[PDB]
Amino acid sequence: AFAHFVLIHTICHGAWIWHKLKPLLEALGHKVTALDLAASGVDPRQIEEIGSFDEYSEPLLTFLEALPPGEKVILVGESCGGLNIAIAADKYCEKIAAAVFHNSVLPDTEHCPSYVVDKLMEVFPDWKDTTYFTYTKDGKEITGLKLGFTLLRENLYTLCGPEEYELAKMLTRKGSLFQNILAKRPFFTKEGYGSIKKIYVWTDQDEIFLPEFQLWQIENYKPDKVYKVEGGDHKLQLTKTKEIAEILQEVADTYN
């Protein structure tokens, strides 16, 4: 079977992270959309204009709204992308065949939206040369960040080629975890987000979302299906592109 995959990058990144996976899924016959989220990739907004993770998720929500009745997609989110999937599933769960988490946060419905992020900051507290700033939007002070080049080299793109790591230094932009507004956001709902099929893909060789954190998430909110990719690094769509497209073909063959 063929599916329509909507690939969702993590904070400080853009659609460009999917530049190897998107042609491979198309060579299997799938339709693929790789979005730039607010103030990400070549989106014209800057992060200081964004006041929440929901506003950050606007391109994905606008995209799902534009789907004609009866059209379903499979969402695929990397790292913070799982939170954009949860926001989207509470507005458009009927348009989501399945959601695939790719070395991603897995929000739940029994604790607040920041829960999993707070636990990530506990397991991985040192973000090395990452820099921080603050800006104000809609009454709230938000901490922005720009991922450090050594953190990028060693923990996110560990085993990626130098030309892939180069794209990250050239293209990663200022972002925000919006951790404080997620903590005060209403919980993801059991009838929206809780109802969608959830497939968790990970590698135990990920150097930032460590096995303790990822195994903690699988245990906290049981996925419908779990795939563990051997080897690679945090950016499995660059180091294990073929294995991710094989997993996504099975998901397209299982969930519609």
Short mmCIF file of C-alpha atoms in Angstrom, two decimals:
data_model
loop_
_atom_site.label_atom_id
_atom_site.label_comp_id
_atom_site.label_asym_id
_atom_site.label_seq_id
_atom_site.Cartn_x
_atom_site.Cartn_y
_atom_site.Cartn_z
CA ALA A 1 0.00 0.00 0.00
CA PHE A 2 0.82 3.65 -0.60
CA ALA A 3 0.26 6.32 2.04
CA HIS A 4 0.62 10.11 2.39
CA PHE A 5 3.38 10.75 4.98
CA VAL A 6 3.64 14.23 6.61
CA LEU A 7 7.16 14.59 8.01
CA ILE A 8 7.57 17.00 10.95
CA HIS A 9 10.98 18.28 12.01
CA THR A 10 12.18 19.13 15.51
CA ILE A 11 12.80 22.60 16.98
CA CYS A 12 15.61 24.66 15.41
CA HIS A 13 15.40 22.48 12.23
CA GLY A 14 13.23 22.46 9.10
CA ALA A 15 11.94 20.20 6.32
CA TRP A 16 15.53 19.95 5.03
CA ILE A 17 16.34 17.26 7.68
CA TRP A 18 14.10 14.94 5.64
CA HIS A 19 15.98 15.52 2.35
CA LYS A 20 17.18 11.91 2.17
CA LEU A 21 14.02 10.16 3.43
CA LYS A 22 11.47 12.01 1.28
CA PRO A 23 12.87 10.82 -2.16
CA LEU A 24 13.20 7.26 -0.82
CA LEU A 25 9.54 7.09 0.33
CA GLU A 26 8.51 8.59 -3.04
CA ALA A 27 10.55 5.84 -4.80
CA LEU A 28 8.30 3.35 -2.95
CA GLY A 29 5.21 5.09 -4.46
CA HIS A 30 4.16 7.23 -1.46
CA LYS A 31 3.12 10.83 -1.37
CA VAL A 32 5.30 12.86 1.02
CA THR A 33 4.84 16.37 2.51
CA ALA A 34 7.79 17.77 4.52
CA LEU A 35 6.66 20.96 6.28
CA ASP A 36 8.52 23.88 7.73
CA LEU A 37 6.88 24.78 11.05
CA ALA A 38 6.60 28.39 12.33
CA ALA A 39 9.93 30.26 12.25
CA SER A 40 11.68 27.10 11.03
CA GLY A 41 13.55 26.20 7.81
CA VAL A 42 12.66 28.89 5.24
CA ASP A 43 9.43 30.01 6.99
CA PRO A 44 9.40 33.86 7.03
CA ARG A 45 8.57 34.32 10.74
CA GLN A 46 11.26 34.70 13.44
CA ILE A 47 10.88 32.82 16.77
CA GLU A 48 10.20 36.01 18.77
CA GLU A 49 6.84 36.22 16.95
CA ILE A 50 5.80 32.77 18.31
CA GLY A 51 4.03 32.70 21.71
CA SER A 52 3.23 28.98 22.13
CA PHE A 53 3.92 25.43 20.90
CA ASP A 54 0.41 25.55 19.32
CA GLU A 55 1.33 28.67 17.31
CA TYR A 56 4.64 26.94 16.41
CA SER A 57 2.55 24.00 15.11
CA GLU A 58 0.45 26.28 12.79
CA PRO A 59 1.85 24.99 9.36
CA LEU A 60 0.92 21.39 10.30
CA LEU A 61 -2.59 22.40 11.49
CA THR A 62 -3.20 24.51 8.37
CA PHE A 63 -2.04 21.58 6.23
CA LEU A 64 -4.41 19.12 7.93
CA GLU A 65 -7.31 21.58 7.62
CA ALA A 66 -6.64 21.71 3.86
CA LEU A 67 -7.07 17.90 3.52
CA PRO A 68 -10.39 17.06 1.72
CA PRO A 69 -12.88 14.86 3.71
CA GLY A 70 -11.86 11.19 3.73
CA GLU A 71 -8.12 11.82 3.20
CA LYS A 72 -5.91 10.34 5.94
CA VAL A 73 -2.18 10.91 6.51
CA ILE A 74 0.53 9.19 8.57
CA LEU A 75 2.37 11.76 10.70
CA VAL A 76 6.11 11.18 11.33
CA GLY A 77 7.77 13.40 13.95
CA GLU A 78 11.40 13.55 15.07
CA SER A 79 12.56 14.66 18.58
CA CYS A 80 10.15 17.56 19.64
CA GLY A 81 7.91 16.64 16.67
CA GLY A 82 5.86 14.30 18.91
CA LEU A 83 4.37 17.37 20.62
CA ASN A 84 3.25 18.84 17.29
CA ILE A 85 1.61 15.42 16.55
CA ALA A 86 -0.27 15.59 19.89
CA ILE A 87 -1.55 19.17 19.24
CA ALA A 88 -2.58 18.17 15.70
CA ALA A 89 -4.35 14.96 16.86
CA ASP A 90 -6.56 16.96 19.23
CA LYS A 91 -7.92 18.94 16.31
CA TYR A 92 -7.74 16.44 13.39
CA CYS A 93 -7.64 12.87 14.73
CA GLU A 94 -10.05 11.68 12.02
CA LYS A 95 -7.49 12.72 9.35
CA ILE A 96 -4.63 10.72 11.05
CA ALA A 97 -4.22 7.07 10.09
CA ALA A 98 -1.25 6.71 12.45
CA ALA A 99 1.54 8.67 14.11
CA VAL A 100 5.16 7.51 14.01
CA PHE A 101 7.54 8.84 16.66
CA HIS A 102 11.17 8.90 15.37
CA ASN A 103 13.58 9.30 18.37
CA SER A 104 10.77 11.48 19.58
CA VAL A 105 9.01 12.69 22.68
CA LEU A 106 5.86 10.76 23.43
CA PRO A 107 3.37 13.04 25.29
CA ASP A 108 0.55 11.36 27.15
CA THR A 109 -2.90 12.25 28.41
CA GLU A 110 -2.57 11.69 32.22
CA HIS A 111 0.10 14.34 32.94
CA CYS A 112 0.58 17.92 31.67
CA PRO A 113 2.00 18.58 28.13
CA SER A 114 5.48 19.36 29.50
CA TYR A 115 5.91 16.13 31.49
CA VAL A 116 8.08 14.24 28.99
CA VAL A 117 10.16 17.35 28.28
CA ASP A 118 10.82 17.86 32.01
CA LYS A 119 11.98 14.24 32.21
CA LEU A 120 14.25 14.77 29.14
CA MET A 121 15.90 17.74 30.86
CA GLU A 122 16.57 15.51 33.88
CA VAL A 123 18.17 12.67 31.82
CA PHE A 124 20.10 15.06 29.55
CA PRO A 125 20.81 18.25 31.54
CA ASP A 126 23.96 19.52 29.81
CA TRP A 127 23.35 20.92 26.35
CA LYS A 128 27.02 21.89 26.04
CA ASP A 129 27.59 25.01 23.83
CA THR A 130 23.87 25.74 23.29
CA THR A 131 23.07 29.39 23.91
CA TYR A 132 19.92 30.87 25.45
CA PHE A 133 18.03 34.12 25.30
CA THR A 134 14.65 35.46 26.44
CA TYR A 135 11.97 37.33 24.59
CA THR A 136 8.44 38.41 25.54
CA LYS A 137 5.32 37.43 23.64
CA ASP A 138 1.69 37.76 24.73
CA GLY A 139 2.52 38.55 28.33
CA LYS A 140 4.93 35.59 28.75
CA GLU A 141 8.73 35.42 28.93
CA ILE A 142 9.93 32.62 26.68
CA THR A 143 13.41 31.14 26.71
CA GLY A 144 14.79 30.80 23.24
CA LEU A 145 17.84 28.69 22.37
CA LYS A 146 20.28 28.09 19.53
CA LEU A 147 21.72 24.61 19.51
CA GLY A 148 25.46 24.57 19.94
CA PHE A 149 27.65 23.27 17.11
CA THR A 150 29.48 20.80 19.41
CA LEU A 151 26.13 19.51 20.77
CA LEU A 152 25.01 19.12 17.14
CA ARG A 153 28.24 17.32 16.19
CA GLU A 154 28.48 15.00 19.14
CA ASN A 155 24.93 14.29 20.29
CA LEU A 156 22.44 14.90 17.44
CA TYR A 157 24.50 14.13 14.31
CA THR A 158 27.06 11.78 15.92
CA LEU A 159 27.55 9.38 13.01
CA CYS A 160 26.24 11.60 10.15
CA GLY A 161 28.67 12.56 7.30
CA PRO A 162 30.49 15.98 7.46
CA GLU A 163 28.26 17.30 4.66
CA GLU A 164 25.12 16.49 6.72
CA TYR A 165 26.57 18.09 9.81
CA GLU A 166 27.42 21.09 7.59
CA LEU A 167 23.74 21.49 6.60
CA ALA A 168 22.90 21.60 10.35
CA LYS A 169 25.45 24.38 11.13
CA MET A 170 24.28 26.34 8.08
CA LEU A 171 20.52 25.89 8.49
CA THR A 172 19.60 25.42 12.19
CA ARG A 173 17.89 28.50 13.55
CA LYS A 174 16.81 30.01 16.94
CA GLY A 175 13.95 28.06 18.50
CA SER A 176 12.22 27.44 21.83
CA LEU A 177 11.02 24.45 23.81
CA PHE A 178 8.15 26.66 25.13
CA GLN A 179 8.47 24.53 28.31
CA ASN A 180 6.75 27.07 30.56
CA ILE A 181 3.69 27.51 28.28
CA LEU A 182 3.43 23.66 27.78
CA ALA A 183 3.33 23.22 31.56
CA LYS A 184 0.28 25.55 31.78
CA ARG A 185 -1.36 24.27 28.53
CA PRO A 186 -4.51 22.03 28.85
CA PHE A 187 -3.74 18.30 28.78
CA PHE A 188 -3.83 16.36 25.49
CA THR A 189 -7.19 14.57 25.32
CA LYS A 190 -7.94 10.89 25.45
CA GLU A 191 -10.55 11.17 22.62
CA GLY A 192 -8.27 13.04 20.17
CA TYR A 193 -4.61 12.31 20.75
CA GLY A 194 -5.25 9.23 22.91
CA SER A 195 -7.29 7.58 20.08
CA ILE A 196 -4.63 7.58 17.35
CA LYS A 197 -2.34 4.64 16.62
CA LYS A 198 1.19 5.33 17.86
CA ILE A 199 4.34 3.65 16.52
CA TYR A 200 7.58 4.30 18.41
CA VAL A 201 10.83 4.11 16.44
CA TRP A 202 14.19 4.52 18.19
CA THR A 203 17.85 3.56 18.40
CA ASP A 204 19.65 2.76 21.66
CA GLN A 205 22.70 4.48 20.14
CA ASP A 206 21.02 7.90 20.28
CA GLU A 207 23.38 10.22 22.16
CA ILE A 208 20.83 12.83 23.35
CA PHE A 209 17.50 10.91 23.83
CA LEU A 210 19.40 8.28 25.87
CA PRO A 211 18.02 4.66 26.37
CA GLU A 212 16.93 5.58 29.95
CA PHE A 213 14.71 8.36 28.55
CA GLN A 214 13.32 6.41 25.57
CA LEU A 215 12.65 3.21 27.56
CA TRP A 216 11.08 5.41 30.25
CA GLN A 217 8.67 6.82 27.62
CA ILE A 218 7.68 3.39 26.17
CA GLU A 219 6.95 2.34 29.75
CA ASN A 220 5.00 5.53 30.57
CA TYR A 221 2.65 5.51 27.55
CA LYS A 222 2.59 2.18 25.81
CA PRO A 223 2.92 2.44 21.99
CA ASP A 224 0.79 0.29 19.67
CA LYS A 225 3.99 -0.91 17.94
CA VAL A 226 7.71 -0.44 18.81
CA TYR A 227 10.58 -0.62 16.29
CA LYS A 228 14.18 -0.49 17.46
CA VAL A 229 16.74 0.34 14.77
CA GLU A 230 20.21 -1.07 15.38
CA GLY A 231 23.02 1.42 15.20
CA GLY A 232 22.75 4.87 13.63
CA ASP A 233 22.34 7.97 15.77
CA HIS A 234 19.63 10.45 16.80
CA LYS A 235 19.14 11.51 13.14
CA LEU A 236 18.04 8.07 11.88
CA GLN A 237 16.50 9.62 8.70
CA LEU A 238 20.14 10.46 7.72
CA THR A 239 22.14 7.50 9.16
CA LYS A 240 19.51 4.76 8.65
CA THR A 241 17.33 6.27 5.90
CA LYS A 242 16.64 2.88 4.23
CA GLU A 243 15.63 1.17 7.50
CA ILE A 244 13.25 4.09 8.35
CA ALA A 245 11.57 3.84 4.89
CA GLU A 246 11.18 0.03 5.38
CA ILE A 247 9.52 0.64 8.79
CA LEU A 248 7.29 3.32 7.28
CA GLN A 249 6.26 0.97 4.42
CA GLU A 250 5.09 -1.58 7.07
CA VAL A 251 3.15 1.13 8.92
CA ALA A 252 1.49 2.17 5.61
CA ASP A 253 0.65 -1.52 5.14
CA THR A 254 -0.76 -1.87 8.70
CA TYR A 255 -2.62 1.42 9.47
CA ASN A 256 -5.07 3.27 7.25
#
